[PDB]
Design a protein around this motif. Structure first.
Motif, mmCIF file in Angstrom:
data_model
loop_
_atom_site.group_PDB
_atom_site.id
_atom_site.type_symbol
_atom_site.label_atom_id
_atom_site.label_comp_id
_atom_site.label_asym_id
_atom_site.label_seq_id
_atom_site.Cartn_x
_atom_site.Cartn_y
_atom_site.Cartn_z
ATOM 1 N N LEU A 271 0.805 -1.214 0.000
ATOM 2 C CA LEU A 271 0.000 0.000 0.000
ATOM 3 C C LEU A 271 0.841 1.269 0.000
ATOM 4 O O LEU A 271 0.301 2.345 -0.278
ATOM 5 C CB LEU A 271 -0.949 -0.003 1.198
ATOM 6 C CG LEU A 271 -2.060 -1.053 1.132
ATOM 7 C CD1 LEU A 271 -2.889 -1.053 2.403
ATOM 8 C CD2 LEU A 271 -2.944 -0.809 -0.079
ATOM 9 N N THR A 272 2.138 1.176 0.298
ATOM 10 C CA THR A 272 2.992 2.357 0.229
ATOM 11 C C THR A 272 3.490 2.650 -1.181
ATOM 12 O O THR A 272 3.785 3.810 -1.491
ATOM 13 C CB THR A 272 4.198 2.203 1.159
ATOM 14 O OG1 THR A 272 4.769 0.899 0.996
ATOM 15 C CG2 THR A 272 3.800 2.414 2.609
ATOM 16 N N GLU A 273 3.594 1.641 -2.046
ATOM 17 C CA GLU A 273 4.291 1.814 -3.318
ATOM 18 C C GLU A 273 3.515 1.383 -4.556
ATOM 19 O O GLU A 273 3.893 1.799 -5.658
ATOM 20 C CB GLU A 273 5.630 1.061 -3.297
ATOM 21 C CG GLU A 273 6.596 1.565 -2.234
ATOM 22 C CD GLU A 273 7.856 0.732 -2.143
ATOM 23 O OE1 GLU A 273 8.180 0.035 -3.125
ATOM 24 O OE2 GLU A 273 8.519 0.769 -1.085
ATOM 25 N N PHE A 274 2.461 0.578 -4.433
ATOM 26 C CA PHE A 274 1.680 0.178 -5.599
ATOM 27 C C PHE A 274 0.686 1.237 -6.085
ATOM 28 O O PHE A 274 0.530 1.379 -7.307
ATOM 29 C CB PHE A 274 0.949 -1.138 -5.316
ATOM 30 C CG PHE A 274 1.517 -2.314 -6.052
ATOM 31 C CD1 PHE A 274 2.089 -2.151 -7.301
ATOM 32 C CD2 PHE A 274 1.484 -3.580 -5.494
ATOM 33 C CE1 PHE A 274 2.612 -3.230 -7.983
ATOM 34 C CE2 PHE A 274 2.008 -4.662 -6.171
ATOM 35 C CZ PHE A 274 2.572 -4.486 -7.416
ATOM 36 N N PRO A 275 -0.040 1.953 -5.216
ATOM 37 C CA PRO A 275 -0.982 2.977 -5.712
ATOM 38 C C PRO A 275 -0.323 4.021 -6.605
ATOM 39 O O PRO A 275 -0.933 4.414 -7.609
ATOM 40 C CB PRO A 275 -1.541 3.598 -4.425
ATOM 41 C CG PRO A 275 -1.517 2.491 -3.469
ATOM 42 C CD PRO A 275 -0.272 1.705 -3.776
ATOM 43 N N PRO A 276 0.891 4.520 -6.296
ATOM 44 C CA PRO A 276 1.516 5.452 -7.258
ATOM 45 C C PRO A 276 1.785 4.825 -8.615
ATOM 46 O O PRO A 276 1.590 5.480 -9.648
ATOM 47 C CB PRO A 276 2.815 5.869 -6.555
ATOM 48 C CG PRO A 276 2.545 5.679 -5.131
ATOM 49 C CD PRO A 276 1.697 4.455 -5.059
ATOM 50 N N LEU A 277 2.228 3.566 -8.638
ATOM 51 C CA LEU A 277 2.480 2.886 -9.904
ATOM 52 C C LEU A 277 1.196 2.735 -10.707
ATOM 53 O O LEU A 277 1.173 2.985 -11.918
ATOM 54 C CB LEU A 277 3.113 1.518 -9.646
ATOM 55 C CG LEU A 277 3.324 0.644 -10.883
ATOM 56 C CD1 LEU A 277 4.476 1.177 -11.715
ATOM 57 C CD2 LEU A 277 3.556 -0.804 -10.492
ATOM 58 N N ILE A 278 0.115 2.320 -10.043
ATOM 59 C CA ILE A 278 -1.162 2.143 -10.728
ATOM 60 C C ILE A 278 -1.677 3.480 -11.245
ATOM 61 O O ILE A 278 -2.197 3.572 -12.366
ATOM 62 C CB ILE A 278 -2.176 1.458 -9.794
ATOM 63 C CG1 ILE A 278 -1.706 0.042 -9.460
ATOM 64 C CG2 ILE A 278 -3.551 1.419 -10.427
ATOM 65 C CD1 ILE A 278 -2.669 -0.737 -8.596
ATOM 66 N N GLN A 279 -1.533 4.539 -10.443
ATOM 67 C CA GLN A 279 -1.965 5.864 -10.871
ATOM 68 C C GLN A 279 -1.191 6.332 -12.095
ATOM 69 O O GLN A 279 -1.780 6.862 -13.046
ATOM 70 C CB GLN A 279 -1.808 6.859 -9.721
ATOM 71 C CG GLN A 279 -2.007 8.308 -10.118
ATOM 72 C CD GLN A 279 -1.881 9.253 -8.941
ATOM 73 O OE1 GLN A 279 -2.182 8.889 -7.804
ATOM 74 N NE2 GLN A 279 -1.430 10.473 -9.208
ATOM 75 N N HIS A 280 0.130 6.134 -12.102
ATOM 76 C CA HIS A 280 0.913 6.561 -13.257
ATOM 77 C C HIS A 280 0.589 5.723 -14.486
ATOM 78 O O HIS A 280 0.560 6.249 -15.604
ATOM 79 C CB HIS A 280 2.407 6.501 -12.958
ATOM 80 C CG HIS A 280 3.249 7.142 -14.018
ATOM 81 N ND1 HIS A 280 3.276 8.504 -14.223
ATOM 82 C CD2 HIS A 280 4.076 6.606 -14.945
ATOM 83 C CE1 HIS A 280 4.092 8.781 -15.223
ATOM 84 N NE2 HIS A 280 4.591 7.646 -15.679
ATOM 85 N N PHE A 281 0.352 4.419 -14.306
ATOM 86 C CA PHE A 281 -0.063 3.586 -15.433
ATOM 87 C C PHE A 281 -1.382 4.075 -16.014
ATOM 88 O O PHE A 281 -1.547 4.132 -17.238
ATOM 89 C CB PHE A 281 -0.178 2.124 -15.003
ATOM 90 C CG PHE A 281 1.132 1.389 -14.984
ATOM 91 C CD1 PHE A 281 2.271 1.958 -15.524
ATOM 92 C CD2 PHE A 281 1.217 0.119 -14.438
ATOM 93 C CE1 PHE A 281 3.475 1.280 -15.510
ATOM 94 C CE2 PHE A 281 2.417 -0.563 -14.422
ATOM 95 C CZ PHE A 281 3.546 0.017 -14.960
#
Lengths: 51, 98, 51, 52, 49, 50
Positions: B42-52
């Motif tokens: 939850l610290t690092e996946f939401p930014p990746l998904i948002q940028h994708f």
């Protein structure tokens, strides 16, 4: 009147819990390594966009 | 009367209730002992998904362009594998003699 | 979700395997991105010169 | 919840569309590794190509 | 059950904003890919071939 | 008393889960298809160990 549906929900909840308990360790190991590669991708978002 | 019926119906499912409790206990124990993995997700996946989600169109365009190139490349390299092999095998000797 | 228990277990295990393989080559992945960024531009330049 | 449902159904559609070409997706990694090895070997074993 | 569920739920609550945004972002990404799934699948197959 | 102090939160949970389940219950077979397709798609990349 909705009691057979309650029984179905309880039995399904038990079965789904058992399946999730069986499949959880692999999922969490994959999530750890996916966090590793996700930090890798985040550190090079600009490089990925240019690519 | 309705409480009698409801309590009978619930008591008839006591074994299933206990089994569901045990199963939920096991799953939640495994998840609790991987709570560290949950935090790291939850610290690092939401930014990746948002940028994708920000660059989904660019990714689709890249995949489609690569597929456009690769379809023509595949047809050319499949329609000219055996013929090129035979032509090279035959032209080896004239090349050597030249 | 219960009736598809085998499928979710199988893709959980496969996610574990793929994530492990991707994480064990983190430096390889970074190098791949960093080299894929300008090599496609160079290939595009070469092709556009012989367009 | 609407986003979750739409996400799940669109993901099912996308996965169904992707894996209908099962053989090529199932061999993409093997073929890309093989072509990488072949290109590496072709460049390596022919060092006189530049002078030619 | 109460202890472990409370632990996981407070872990999720600590990232409540990100957990809320990631569902929307993932839905947007999946919809954008599904609207072009057939060209994407064809392109992947062509790349492999 | 413990339930009554958290009664508002519990019934907010009930309403929110009702919305969630009412919006997701129609696609049970599509969910089975999603899980099977995901398993096949992941099998497409894990035929060997490396």
């Amino acid at each position: 009147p909705r009691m057979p549906q309650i029984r179905r929900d309880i039995t399904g909840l038990a079965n789904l819990g058992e399946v999730y308990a069986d499949a959880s360790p692999d999922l969490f190991d994959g999530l750890d390594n996916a966090v590793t590669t996700a930090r890798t991708l985040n550190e090079q978002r600009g490089n990925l966009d240019q690519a | 009367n309705q409480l009698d019926t409801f309590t009978d119906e619930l008591n008839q499912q006591r074994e299933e209730i206990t089994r569901a409790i045990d199963s939920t206990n096991r799953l939640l124990n495994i998840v609790s002992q991987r709570n560290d993995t949950l935090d790291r997700v939850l610290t690092e996946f939401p930014p990746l998904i948002q940028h994708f989600a920000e660059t989904r169109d660019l990714f689709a365009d890249a995949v489609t362009a690569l597929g456009r190139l690769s379809a023509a490349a595949d047809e050319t390299l499949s329609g000219s594998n055996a013929n090129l092999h035979t032509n090279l095998q035959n032209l080896q000797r004239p090349l050597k003699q030249l | 979700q219960v009736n598809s228990g085998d499928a979710i277990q199988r893709w959980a295990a496969n996610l574990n395997t793929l994530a492990a393989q991707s994480a064990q080559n983190d430096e390889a992945l970074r190098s791949g991105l960093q080299q894929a960024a300008p090599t496609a531009d160079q290939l595009n330049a070469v092709f556009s010169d012989v367009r | 919840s609407t986003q979750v449902n739409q996400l799940l159904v669109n993901a099912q559609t996308l996965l169904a569309a992707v894996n209908e070409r099962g053989r090529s997706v199932s061999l993409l990694l093997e073929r890309v590794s093989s072509v990488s090895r072949q290109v590496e070997g072709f460049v390596d074993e022919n060092p006189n190509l530049n002078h030619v | 059950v109460i202890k472990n569920l409370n632990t996981v739920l407070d872990t999720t609550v600590r990232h409540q904003k990100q957990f809320d945004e990631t569902l929307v972002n993932f839905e947007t990404l999946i919809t954008g890919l599904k609207n072009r799934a057939d060209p994407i699948a064809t392109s992947v197959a062509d790349i492999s071939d | 008393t413990a339930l009554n102090e958290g009664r508002g939160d519990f019934f907010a949970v009930v309403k929110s889960l009702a919305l969630f389940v009412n919006a997701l219950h129609r696609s049970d077979q599509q969910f089975v298809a999603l899980n099977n397709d995901l398993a096949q798609f992941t099998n497409s990349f894990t035929n060997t160990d490396q």
